[PDB]
Amino acid sequence: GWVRPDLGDLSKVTKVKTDRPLPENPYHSRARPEPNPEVEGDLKPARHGSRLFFWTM
Amino acid sequence: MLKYIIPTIMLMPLTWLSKNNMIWVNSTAHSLLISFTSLLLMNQFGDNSLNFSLLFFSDSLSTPLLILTMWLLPLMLMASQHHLSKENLTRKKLFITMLISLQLFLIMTFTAMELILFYILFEATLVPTLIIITRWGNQTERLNAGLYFLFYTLAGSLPLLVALIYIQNTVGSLNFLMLQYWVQPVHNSWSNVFMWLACMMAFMVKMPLYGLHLWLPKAHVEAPIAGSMVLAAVLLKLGGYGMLRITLILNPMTDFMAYPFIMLSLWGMIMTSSICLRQTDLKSLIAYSSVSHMALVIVAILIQTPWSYMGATALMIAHGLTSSMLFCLANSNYERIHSRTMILARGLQTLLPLMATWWLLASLTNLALPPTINLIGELFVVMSTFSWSNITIILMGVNMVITALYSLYMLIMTQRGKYTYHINNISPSFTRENALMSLHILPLLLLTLNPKIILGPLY
Numbered sequence A: 001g002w003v004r005p006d007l008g009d010l011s012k013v014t015k016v017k018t019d020r021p022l023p024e025n026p027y028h029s030r031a032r033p034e035p036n037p038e039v040e041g042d043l044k045p046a047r048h049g050s051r052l053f054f055w056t057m
Numbered sequence B: 001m002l003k004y005i006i007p008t009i010m011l012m013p014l015t016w017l018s019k020n021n022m023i024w025v026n027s028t029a030h031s032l033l034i035s036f037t038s039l040l041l042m043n044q045f046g047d048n049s050l051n052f053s054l055l056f057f058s059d060s061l062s063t064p065l066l067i068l069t070m071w072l073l074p075l076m077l078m079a080s081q082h083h084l085s086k087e088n089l090t091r092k093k094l095f096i097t098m099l100i101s102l103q104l105f106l107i108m109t110f111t112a113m114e115l116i117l118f119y120i121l122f123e124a125t126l127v128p129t130l131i132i133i134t135r136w137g138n139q140t141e142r143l144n145a146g147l148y149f150l151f152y153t154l155a156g157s158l159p160l161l162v163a164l165i166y167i168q169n170t171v172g173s174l175n176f177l178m179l180q181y182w183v184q185p186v187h188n189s190w191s192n193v194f195m196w197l198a199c200m201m202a203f204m205v206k207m208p209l210y211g212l213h214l215w216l217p218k219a220h221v222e223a224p225i226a227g228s229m230v231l232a233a234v235l236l237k238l239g240g241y242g243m244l245r246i247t248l249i250l251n252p253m254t255d256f257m258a259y260p261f262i263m264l265s266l267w268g269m270i271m272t273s274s275i276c277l278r279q280t281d282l283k284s285l286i287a288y289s290s291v292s293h294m295a296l297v298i299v300a301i302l303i304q305t306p307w308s309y310m311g312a313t314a315l316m317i318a319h320g321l322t323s324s325m326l327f328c329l330a331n332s333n334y335e336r337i338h339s340r341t342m343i344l345a346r347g348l349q350t351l352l353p354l355m356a357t358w359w360l361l362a363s364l365t366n367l368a369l370p371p372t373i374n375l376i377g378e379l380f381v382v383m384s385t386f387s388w389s390n391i392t393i394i395l396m397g398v399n400m401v402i403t404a405l406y407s408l409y410m411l412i413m414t415q416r417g418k419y420t421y422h423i424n425n426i427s428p429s430f431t432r433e434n435a436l437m438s439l440h441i442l443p444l445l446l447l448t449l450n451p452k453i454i455l456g457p458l459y
């Protein structure tokens, strides 16, 4: 009763029902380093300007 | 300070937009008006300095130096216009522009609150001064005089910049009002020894300190008259003004660091006064005379007493008028005989009776006759250095004798004796020259009536 599969059939992506649980950390990754604190708020003018030596702006 | 900065800047368009034959009239007239308004800076208080803005201030130290600066510009214009008469019009206007740009930098230099601003302006004065000497000097070795003047200054000024930037990083500010309250003592260490030297050597070269002084006679012998006038009267005092300010942040290290400079000054004033007895160039004699007088100012600043600071302020103002007047007197002879040799033209009192009187008055102030502010300043320093050490009275007294000797020797050699037979072009003194001499000596002598306005903050 075997029917030869048609051109293109064996290259299809298929789906299998497995009772094997999905691995959680297959790469065995360590915890990632914590990101740098996010800088936020309202942008205000620089306090007394550039403050470069004698400049007042 | 904008009421002085802006009208000074406007002198430039005034000069360039004037009719060809009005450039000296207009620049002179309007620079005299600026000088008149400068007297509004006399609003000084007993406790607080006159603090205009975030950039500029004026205390009793800077105010007399500002008035002297703005008074000197019209005098330099009057003194210059004769030997520049053949110059083409554009180059005359460029010459006047250098003098105006020098005033602009100077009045900003004396009134800056922040020390880096003072540094930039203090350095900027070099450019017009150098250009005035090398472009409008007469002789070949004006080129060398420019390089000596340029590189003596920068040899000391670059370490000062590094120290100033270092001080701001440590203290957080270079505003002079802030430094008065946040100043901390300077402890002993090799690092602080070089900080001290970097903070001071640039001003020592300007004064000039004895042993770093040889650029000065070279510069004077080459400079045109206006160059000598501003150099002798104001540019030397930039170093004196700089030391009076920066010593604030150098205690207590100044206690032992001042010694070698005091020794150089105390001995140098005798050496340079004696050298004047044997000088053959009149301009070089006046140049060496300045070195001797400024040695007293250095001692006064270094010993840091209320009496010495008052004497230093009076000496700086008094010397500025006196030395400028002497170069003008020396230049009036030069414009007739075209030589600076002191022994060439003798017995000039017979030929120029009223100019002999100006010579007499300039000499009398140079040897500090009481009660001229010349003596007031010298006496206050002599008073204060005696307390510093009683033996100093010996060197101070000896210097007084030699100063009288060379001052009067100048007068006797050029004005007295017989006139030189072959010099037959001694024409009568012009009104311009007589006015120029009187515009030095009259304000100098009027200051005797009210010395307090030249005694500085410690008054």
Ligand SMILES: CCCCCCCCCCCCO[C@@H]1O[C@H](CO)[C@@H](O[C@H]2O[C@H](CO)[C@@H](O)[C@H](O)[C@H]2O)[C@H](O)[C@H]1O
Residues within 6 Å of the ligand: B016, B017, B018, B019, B020
């Ligand atoms: C649009 C942005 C640019 C803004 C420019 C604003 C200023 C414009 C000025 C235009 C007028 C210039 O004026 C032109 O130059 C000078 C001075 O002015 C005059 O000629 C000058 O000669 C000598 C100086 O060398 C003097 O006698 C006097 O300064 C003047 O007579 C010319 O006779 C005039 O034709």
Ligand SMILES: CCCCCCCCCCCCO[C@@H]1O[C@H](CO)[C@@H](O[C@H]2O[C@H](CO)[C@@H](O)[C@H](O)[C@H]2O)[C@H](O)[C@H]1O
Residues within 6 Å of the ligand: B188, B189, B190, B193, B257, B260, B261
């Ligand atoms: C015309 C130029 C005139 C130049 C005048 C020169 C003056 C010379 C001053 C010498 C004193 C220098 O400053 C001196 O530096 C050393 C640095 O080691 C400091 O001493 C420090 O180092 C030494 C190491 O030998 C330690 O023993 C000491 O415990 C430590 O405090 C001194 O406390 C300080 O007195």
